[PDB]
Write an enzyme that holds these catalytic residues in place. Sequence first.
Site, short mmCIF file in Angstrom:
data_model
loop_
_atom_site.label_atom_id
_atom_site.label_comp_id
_atom_site.label_asym_id
_atom_site.label_seq_id
_atom_site.Cartn_x
_atom_site.Cartn_y
_atom_site.Cartn_z
N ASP B 324 -9.78 -4.13 3.19
CA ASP B 324 -8.57 -3.66 2.55
C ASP B 324 -7.85 -4.82 1.85
O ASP B 324 -6.74 -4.68 1.38
CB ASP B 324 -7.61 -3.04 3.60
N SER B 349 -3.16 -7.45 -0.12
CA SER B 349 -3.23 -6.50 0.95
C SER B 349 -3.09 -5.13 0.34
O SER B 349 -2.00 -4.77 -0.07
CB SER B 349 -2.13 -6.76 1.96
N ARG B 350 -4.21 -4.39 0.27
CA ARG B 350 -4.25 -3.03 -0.30
C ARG B 350 -3.26 -2.06 0.34
O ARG B 350 -2.81 -1.11 -0.29
CB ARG B 350 -5.66 -2.45 -0.25
N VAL B 351 -2.92 -2.33 1.60
CA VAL B 351 -1.92 -1.56 2.30
C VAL B 351 -0.53 -1.88 1.77
O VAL B 351 0.24 -0.96 1.45
CB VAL B 351 -2.01 -1.79 3.79
#
Lengths: 468, 482, 483
Positions: B324, B349-351
Amino acid sequence: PITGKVTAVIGAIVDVHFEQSELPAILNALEIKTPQGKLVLEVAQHLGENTVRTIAMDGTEGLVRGEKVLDTGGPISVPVGRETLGRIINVIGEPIDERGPIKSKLRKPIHADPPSFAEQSTSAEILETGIKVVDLLAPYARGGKIGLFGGAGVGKTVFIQELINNIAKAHGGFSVFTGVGERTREGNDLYREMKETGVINLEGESKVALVFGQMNEPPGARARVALTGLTIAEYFRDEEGQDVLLFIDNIFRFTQAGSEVSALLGRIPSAVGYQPTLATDMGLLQERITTTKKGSVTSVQAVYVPADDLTDPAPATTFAHLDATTVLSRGISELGIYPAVDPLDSKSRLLDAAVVGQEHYDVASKVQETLQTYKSLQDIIAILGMDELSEQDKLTVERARKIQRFLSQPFAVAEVFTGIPGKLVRLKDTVASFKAVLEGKYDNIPEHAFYMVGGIEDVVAKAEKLAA
Amino acid sequence: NLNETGRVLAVGDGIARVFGLNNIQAEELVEFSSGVKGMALNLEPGQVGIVLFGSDRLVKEGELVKRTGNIVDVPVGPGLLGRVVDALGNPIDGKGPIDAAGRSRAQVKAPGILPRRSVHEPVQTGLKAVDALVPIGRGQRELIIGDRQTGKTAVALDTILNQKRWNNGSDESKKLYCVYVAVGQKRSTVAQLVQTLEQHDAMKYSIIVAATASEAAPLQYLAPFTAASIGEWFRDNGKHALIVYDDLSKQAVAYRQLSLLLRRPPGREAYPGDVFYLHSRLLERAAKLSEKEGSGSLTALPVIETQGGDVSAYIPTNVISITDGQIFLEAELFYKGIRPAINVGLSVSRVGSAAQVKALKQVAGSLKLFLAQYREVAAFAQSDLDASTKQTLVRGERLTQLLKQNQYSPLATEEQVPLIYAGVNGHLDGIELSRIGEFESSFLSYLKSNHNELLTEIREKGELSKELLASLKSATESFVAT
Amino acid sequence: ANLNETGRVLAVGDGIARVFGLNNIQAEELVEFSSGVKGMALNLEPGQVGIVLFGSDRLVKEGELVKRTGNIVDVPVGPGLLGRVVDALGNPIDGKGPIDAAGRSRAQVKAPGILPRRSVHEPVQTGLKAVDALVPIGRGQRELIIGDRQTGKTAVALDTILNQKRWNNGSDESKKLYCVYVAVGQKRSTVAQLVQTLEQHDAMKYSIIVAATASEAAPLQYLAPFTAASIGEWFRDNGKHALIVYDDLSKQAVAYRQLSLLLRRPPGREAYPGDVFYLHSRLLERAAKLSEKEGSGSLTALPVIETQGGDVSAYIPTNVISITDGQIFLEAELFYKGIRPAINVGLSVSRVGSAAQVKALKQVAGSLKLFLAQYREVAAFAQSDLDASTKQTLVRGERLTQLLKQNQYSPLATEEQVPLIYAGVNGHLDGIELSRIGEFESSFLSYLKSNHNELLTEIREKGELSKELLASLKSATESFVAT
Ligand SMILES: Nc1ncnc2c1ncn2[C@@H]1O[C@H](COP(=O)(O)OP(=O)(O)NP(=O)(O)O)[C@@H](O)[C@H]1O
Ligand SMILES: Nc1ncnc2c1ncn2[C@@H]1O[C@H](COP(=O)(O)OP(=O)(O)NP(=O)(O)O)[C@@H](O)[C@H]1O
Ligand SMILES: [Mg+2]
Ligand SMILES: [Mg+2]
């Protein structure tokens, strides 16, 4: 029923022995019973001496030499028809959403021949999306393939969900979304978001079918999911005569899965490590997405570029089948423009006087030249000011600012997140609306009146509110 | 017997080819006359290829081989906390037998589409650079990547040291139990890691799983999976675990050794065509479960070593696309003073926000920007520069300097926010570049002495009211002048 | 159970079927499998025969019966194939009934030797100002069209085919030029749209399409150019002239590499097999101009090659350059600017075409080739001093560049091309704004058609420009330029 025995297990490759002249055809699905559910194998080769080599669709830990193997008589088959809408389905057609079985009327094989040469439509034609930037500057081909570019933080999923919504409301056509090598975390997010947006409605009617082939599934599964998703989409075309959307995210991941399967079968890899059947593998999938006499499947495909090398075998082969590209860009969203479509990068083969008409083309071309001159002049604006500009130039730059903002549009699906009611603009209106701007019929109108609106009438309406 | 037993056909290079074992399972564990074990990876028409867990000097042609009937598994449960085990869960720390809650297979299906919930709770690393700019959520996979010796392990270890803040309390939903997987490392290095956790009283909530450099290749290949099962006990029981795979590079290399010696087809860099599947099977096991399933979590920090910064090599390509996001370390930054050596432009951070304490998000939002604008204008750092670009240079340098942080010194969120608040708002611009370090120290203790009420509100409420903002503003302005 | 005329499948996999028996079979013979799929006997060994499938592996099973055909891989040939679309084996794929065949030729036919040939001297009029004037093509010549993806390659070939409408409706057989278009690896929808374009322009009646599309098995892709060449060769052998476009050899070579790797032939450069040059060389050598003794027929070849990133130094691109008689290089940078055709003049060449160029063009296009390829080098150095002599060549070059732009589907008569080039080269466009060069052409041709129609006719009928006619061209131009 025909019965075989497992003779060899090597990772995801399994070999099965059958009796004299009872061998299943290459690409037949075989079934082993497991305590969990069933392991499906797909026949890859006939090795001789009544033995077939297969690729597993699931893990093979636990398999024992001699285990009973059933031949289903055909290829992997999937449930098709209206009963697939709002359901999550895996590669072998099982539901993976715990909502019971898909009580479908038919199942169809995932391997099928492309429509005949004689069955092909003879003229390219536009699929009207209702999204201004797309319809005007980079129109989708009906029955074509569109490269969708851009990662996270660009409103990609909202863009997909508006196409689903718009095609259903405008053309009465359903959609199929296929996650090929999708992150499980992101399928869970996509499903939860489709329910929030309305494109899936458990209690009511859904507009899209979800087919997922997760990253953690073996190469054979990730290579076939696209065909599973595609077959559901094909049924809507052939049987119900619809204009269907098929979303493939990511087509690169379908390529790598095919590389991995090929490698596992002992085939000698081609340039850059890809499978020797790279182009035919791609053609056997892509050629099925096309317009027939009954209707059409149109595919929007997320494309990853390895190493940003467009000459890499994977993108180069993919690009041969693309008819348009939609480029979503952080530079467009940072300016506050939604959908965040780059108006210059996004290109369509169908932007031609022969297909869209002379007016449509001339309107679109002038718009592109306006924004291009604007882009170049950005530098001298930042230091010298707007005083250092000629009459013809300062006017087009003023007009460019407006055109840019007019390319934005509220989306119906995003209404839950924004509170702003969404607009679906018709192609005929988009052409006329921009044409009227380019000639200078709305120069006295303030820039903010073009921001987040529909047709030209929405501009006139808002301008009267913002003045008085 | 011929069904539960076998004879050794041939043996060499950790492989033994065995006749019979007709009823054996793929990936089943086996046992040789001499005492050494191994697993049956290849089941072929008239023979079985078994990879050994120990030296092949112990196996001979003709020797008897017995099934065990068991797919590879490992003991699991809280009994393991503070223990050091090998890839099969045997104690290697001289502390006696392990008490297991049960046993779990090394290979387990990841939670599907349905039993998960969006990542929304922080893993607070304690590192200003990470928590502010590359925030990690519970159930996320965030890869730590870079050349040899750039501080990859230090990031993981600092994250493990930090968890004390909550592991010492009684609220279990805030706790983070740590699993550290040493793959291919030398023993003394692991021994030293253990001594380090011990000195910071961090062992008591950690589990070390070690498949070191001299151990057979199958043990190094198993250790990540085994460890994941150990971590899944926490996840499956409404608790939260963090797993560090240090590192997945060397794990790939062990899998490649077995694959080549079993004569499976090679591809790019001689990896087998299921090396991607190896790592994706492993990493999708990191997840955030739904309420129905207890809301437990597993968070993965896999490590990958690049060669000369090459993220296009086969294994880095694989893992990068599976996780992610990336925390990218670089030697150039390290030598510059910038430690941890995080290249902010290349890390993600893809989140994103969802995994950030709101307090930090309220100041970190503009930090990302000021740094972005700073990287564009970096070159302009050498006499005739206008107002705006001179300013971007002043903030940039100081914000960069604030993110420097000593090893083994993770900071609480309430210590993080006043520092970033001060920086972002301009309160540091007047202070000379070399004094930012001493500023941090003095400012924190001044706040602990005189404004502890504000610190306490940050920690407890996790947000910043307009009242807090103004209080902070006053406390910062007050200290700057002094 | 003839195991001399018949086989049993031993194993099937990777597009190869291993068959037991077939003892009387010839190397490269066609066979028929139980399901209807066809294959080709590739390697005959003691005990078994290896057969390459012209279809999917699905269609063949262990233990099935295989039948000999007694024919080396071949195809229907003759005039009756005109206006027809067919697959690689000559099977009709357009729904129009069976093929009317004069006979059958093998797929692999050896190219005519040193003796039966004669120098090219007859024009292939493309109708493209940029091509006809700068890179003229002779009947029997091989001219490569090469460039990146989406640079106008097919458009050059397709415009050449549309142009033949000029003679193919006429009576005189030597002037006619029949066209064979070979689609290798393309999308069906692209081909069906291309055929619809040919029908719309009435050009289908004199051409033959041969299609092995992207989903079809690799051996049918490998095969299509060869069988198309035999269909081309019929006209060549019978005193007529065919043009053959191989669109494209890049995709052929990708297909051949698939068989070779599946057959485990050692990979060389970019993983192609050692014999990938030979694949193209034996194919392209069949395009020839025959002697008076052999009937004077000719087969002209326009192969297409796709570069990657405009790199002509690559293996497949250079193999084909070292076979053909010149190249038309299409440049992405020119294409993007809107210069179309996007011919890069310095990198394009016709090796043998000058001797076949219509004399009238040759005369008014004196040095144009050298000049343009030189202007571009003066243009690049312009972005240091406003030098007097160089500013004039900068004014000519821009005009000449604009003049060579041409719309798609709009091929021009040689009599229509000569006066435009005359007006350019001689400097008559030098006082006209750049934006009106396009407007000049359409207006100038109307003028010449309505007024000086006598001059246009003479150019058409004689193909040369006598001193008298040249002076008459000078008057007509100057008067129009004035007004
Ligand atoms: N924040 C820090 N401040 C100062 N020194 C540090 C910091 N982080 C790491 N180091 C030192 O830098 C060196 C590299 O750290 P380490 O965490 O071992 O990197 P690594 O990339 O995992 N090295 P290796 O695994 O041996 O390739 C060690 O000496 C650390 O103690
Ligand atoms: N002279 C021209 N003027 C304007 N447009 C043109 C011209 N020639 C070609 N085009 C257009 O440019 C696009 C590409 O032309 P095409 O002949 O398909 O090139 P290609 O190199 O064969 N492309 P592909 O086969 O897809 O790599 C098409 O949309 C054409 O209609
Ligand atoms: Mg380390
Ligand atoms: Mg083309």
